[PDB]
Design a protein around this ligand. Structure first.
Ligand SMILES: NC(=O)C1=CN([C@@H]2O[C@H](COP(=O)(O)OP(=O)(O)OC[C@H]3O[C@@H](n4cnc5c(N)ncnc54)[C@H](OP(=O)(O)O)[C@@H]3O)[C@@H](O)[C@H]2O)C=CC1
Ligand SMILES: NC(=O)C1=CN([C@@H]2O[C@H](COP(=O)(O)OP(=O)(O)OC[C@H]3O[C@@H](n4cnc5c(N)ncnc54)[C@H](OP(=O)(O)O)[C@@H]3O)[C@@H](O)[C@H]2O)C=CC1
Ligand SMILES: NC(=O)C1=CN([C@@H]2O[C@H](COP(=O)(O)OP(=O)(O)OC[C@H]3O[C@@H](n4cnc5c(N)ncnc54)[C@H](OP(=O)(O)O)[C@@H]3O)[C@@H](O)[C@H]2O)C=CC1
Ligand SMILES: NC(=O)C1=CN([C@@H]2O[C@H](COP(=O)(O)OP(=O)(O)OC[C@H]3O[C@@H](n4cnc5c(N)ncnc54)[C@H](OP(=O)(O)O)[C@@H]3O)[C@@H](O)[C@H]2O)C=CC1
Ligand SMILES: Cc1c(N)cccc1Cn1ccc(OCCc2cccs2)cc1=O
Ligand SMILES: Cc1c(N)cccc1Cn1ccc(OCCc2cccs2)cc1=O
Ligand SMILES: Cc1c(N)cccc1Cn1ccc(OCCc2cccs2)cc1=O
Ligand SMILES: Cc1c(N)cccc1Cn1ccc(OCCc2cccs2)cc1=O
Lengths: 254, 254, 255, 254
């Protein structure tokens, strides 16, 4: 029951974004929501998508995580429009496509530092800024993948980028824990999102999950969302620095 | 909302038990509850505590998990008496005092196997019999300690038993996954229960947690129960074979 | 590595395909004196025949059924009398009933479960307590594990719970015996066609998977375990305790 | 016995370096060694460390790993001067102290990506260029710290770089496995080296080891070299993507 609660959701591109699953679940549970976006596709788009929700008013902010200025000013503006918040759902990453379908040993320095910047550092800077709006504490969640933990074929540079995120979570949880702010991750199983298009060896995973994972099925964005409701609410008080696998138990098998 | 849900809670001994933390939370949420005990002692207790709960009917069953008969015939009586359930909270462990204050290399064989019997194997037989009452699926949750992943001073044989329980949870997960039974653990941080009582200076991993955990506090039974409610309900739906730490972040640090 | 003037007790040779034998060949190649324990008479006969491949001028065989306190106690006492102090122990011993491996994991009998815990895990503890007595300046104790102790592996079942138990056992003994300069470590060998795999479903299909999916594209063998064991058992690993080395062509590190 | 073997060693600063402990071990075992340095300071130092060693006409090379070209041309010059190698020991990382002095949440973007650059990607590019000189296969090892796996107090942005490194080592292992190149990490305990010199959190942990690690002592650079020699040799064939902890058992307790 999330009435009276306010969350910022970052990383909705369209109806298939993991973050849209998050949105729908907190909306249903009565949370006030705030959204951020990178460009103008996610802009008109988002507006249309929020007609699916039950938000009295549309708080959207253009934040590109590569600018410190846009993250600092963006969160400050959110503060001025909606007051204090109770949490942030981080759902932002990027790797160059070429770096995923070539050999990991061939990853450019640019492609590598690029994926670090967007997929991992974003969360540090966003967490420093969002902290200003959480005086009595709150909850930050980020979205990761098992490739951060073990080497998965063709995940490559994004795997290194998610290992970095998952350690980010750990260091943020210990830094902000005394300020009563919890920092956790959701390691989601593979889902058919926009970024999932044209990635090498992706749709073979969906299949292998079906055959091998304890639950013999794949997950969906609404499943990630539910666990997100958990991590973002007081139900998870006491739980921080953690990584919850919403993945049909694929993580627990070899 | 867990109305129209029924859960079996194993291992309330008194007001301070971890399992009563779980009970309160789930009762609050409208669930029906079924309780099991070992001792006569823990029964007159169970009856008393029920007065603090919204349970119009006391359903209590004596099950000593050392007995195959008592576990088969107990779950069979639950099922006649109440019907299908939605899952099971397993909060049962034991080790001889004598072995935990000795050096781990001095542990008696009988001590070691008995801790294994009650703390790990009991979940396996419990799962197999509880599955009988879960035709459409459900969720099984066991309680562990960080001493099962890493060597914790003085936890000794119980750590080994907890390691075996975490593995057991993984194998059960993969076995009972195609039956839509999810199996998970909560790794509780230290708590002042009737069990903590004996261990000397147990007060000092207690103090250590205050000083060093990210949240700089110790967790409570109700915080366990809140995470339990997540795992036992449809909220945790894509999560199985997982070990969630309700220990204020203690596991993410060194 | 130079193991001359060093002495090691090797537990769990049963035939020429035993992982403990790949261990024995290598330590022998490096100049170590070796002492052997066996359970079945059939294994003692094997050991006799097998020395003939080794350069062990004196043949030391001891019957130790690790189910028995008395047998472990007396066995290690007799070893002290007969050969004196030792530099480490290789433990290469496990058991699980075949009924429990063919059933679903949920169906495992209590008896099978506890027998698996007793022999595959508890025996490292008693072994370490009595071995320690022969190591007053310290030494190195090594056990063998398998990845199904860390992740649920299909068909490995009760044994997986057993290896999980052993792997914690290694950590608690490392912590307990550290102050006595005794290091305790495990090797997670990849799957190897021993006498003990022979019966087992799931085995032939994991082997193939390793070849196909593990970073090195091949399966490992008993000598490779042996080599890593010489590192663990020697001063080459003087800083290493409570550690689990996967000798498995990198299959642990992928998904 | 690494007779007839050739190894490139990167990151000797002084006689207290970890990489020099490695060098002494490998030199004792009769291996050929190549050195790389950034600062001429470190060259001067190398030049005189050599008298301790039994190398005939030692080859020293400046490689600042922040530079693509110094690294390609560096290894290209090494294949020319001495031909094929059998291995690389990577002992290189950097983080600004002002990132480390502050709370982790205040970490500059710049300081994060530089850490990543120097401490993590430097491995990827090095691997790719050293592959060239290891046609029949070989062995690559790098140096991490337990702060890569867990949040260690004050380790801050380096913990995130080391996490990244650890992932890199795995993903290099899977891409490079088929070309018979093994890739591994050593997780060293704290040692008083040149780069330990300004750092907060160092005495704290160094003392906790003595009191808490199983061996109740801290480790030293030669103990690291011994494990380096194992992984860089045929003794560890079948071992890849692994992180060996040379830290008196500290990694294994909690
Ligand atoms: N799909 C899957 O199977 C899995 C996904 N994940 C993770 O979950 C998260 C959600 O991604 P997903 O829904 O899959 O796909 P999407 O492509 O829907 O969402 C990714 C979002 O990241 C945004 N983004 C990228 N770069 C920046 C930037 N510099 N500043 C701001 N926003 C940026 C994109 O914005 P824009 O579109 O405006 O360019 C987009 O909205 C990611 O972190 C992903 O790694 C984890 C496990 C598996
Ligand atoms: N206390 C703590 O700080 C922590 C505890 N844990 C774990 O939490 C769980 C509950 O612990 P906790 O509440 O602390 O202590 P409690 O003493 O409250 O609960 C232990 C329960 O185990 C029951 N039990 C013991 N042996 C048997 C048996 N043979 N058959 C049936 N039931 C049996 C006891 O019943 P009876 O009293 O009637 O014999 C009792 O109800 C255990 O798994 C424990 O290891 C995990 C992390 C930390
Ligand atoms: N084979 C594989 O693929 C892998 C094996 N392992 C592990 O490696 C170790 C060696 O297995 P492996 O060599 O493959 O098979 P083996 O059968 O060759 O060796 C197992 C040994 O255990 C002994 N043993 C069994 N019960 C007892 C007992 N009560 N007392 C004393 N010794 C006993 C057997 O001797 P006896 O017959 O005389 O009783 C035999 O020597 C085991 O720990 C196994 O779990 C780990 C990873 C993979
Ligand atoms: N000291 C410790 O307690 C521990 C150290 N480690 C790791 O061991 C490794 C070695 O460090 P350590 O021996 O402690 O101390 P050192 O200062 O002796 O070694 C660090 C080396 O990295 C080199 N280096 C730094 N930046 C660059 C660059 N831009 N290009 C090329 N080389 C560079 C330095 O060379 P130059 O001076 O010429 O710029 C220096 O030789 C590091 O990865 C460190 O994180 C791991 C665990 C604990
Ligand atoms: C944002 C982004 C970009 N720029 C490129 C590739 C992937 C992604 C997001 N994404 C999408 C799918 C995903 O699936 C994990 C399963 C896979 C395994 C190997 C390749 S994909 C993980 C994942 O992180
Ligand atoms: C059921 C039981 C029995 N019979 C004996 C000892 C312990 C327990 C339960 N318990 C109790 C306390 C606990 O504390 C975790 C912190 C500790 C570390 C070392 C000793 S206590 C963990 C834990 O598992
Ligand atoms: C000593 C013993 C007994 N008594 C019963 C089962 C297995 C073993 C030995 N063994 C043999 C093979 C092995 O292979 C690991 C690969 C597998 C995966 C699933 C089933 S086997 C591991 C392993 O432990
Ligand atoms: C190369 C570098 C730079 N530039 C800055 C800080 C540290 C280091 C190297 N280093 C040095 C010491 C060390 O000690 C680990 C123990 C600690 C724990 C918390 C703080 S230090 C680990 C470690 O990685």
């Amino acid at each position: 029951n999330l009435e009276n609660k306010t969350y910022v959701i970052m990383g909705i591109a369209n109806k298939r974004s993991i973050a849209f699953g998050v949105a729908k679940v907190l909306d249903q549970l009565g949370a006030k929501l705030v959204f951020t976006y990178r460009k103008e596709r996610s802009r008109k788009e988002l507006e249309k998508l929020l007609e699916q929700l039950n938000q009295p008013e549309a708080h959207l902010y253009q934040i590109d995580v590569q600018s410190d200025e846009e993250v600092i000013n963006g969160f400050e503006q959110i503060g001025k429009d909606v007051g204090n918040i109770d949490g942030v759902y981080h759902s932002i990453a990027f790797a160059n496509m070429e770096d995923l379908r070539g050999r990991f040993s061939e990853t450019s320095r640019e492609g590598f530092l690029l994926a670090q910047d967007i997929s991992s550092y974003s969360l540090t800077i966003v967490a420093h800024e969002a902290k200003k709006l959480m005086p009595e504490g709150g909850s930050i969640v980020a979205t990761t993948y098992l490739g951060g933990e073990f080497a998965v074929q063709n995940y490559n540079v994004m795997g290194v980028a998610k290992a970095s995120l998952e350690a980010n979570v750990k260091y943020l949880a210990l830094d902000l824990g005394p300020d009563n702010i919890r920092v956790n991750a959701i390691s989601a199983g593979p889902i058919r999102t926009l970024s999932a298009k044209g990635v090498g060896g992706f749709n073979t995973i969906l299949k292998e999950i079906e055959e091998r994972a304890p639950l013999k099925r794949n997950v969906d964005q609404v499943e990630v969302g539910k666990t997100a409701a958990y991590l973002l609410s007081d139900l998870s008080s006491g739980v921080t620095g953690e990584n919850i696998h919403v993945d049909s138990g694929f993580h627990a098998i070899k």
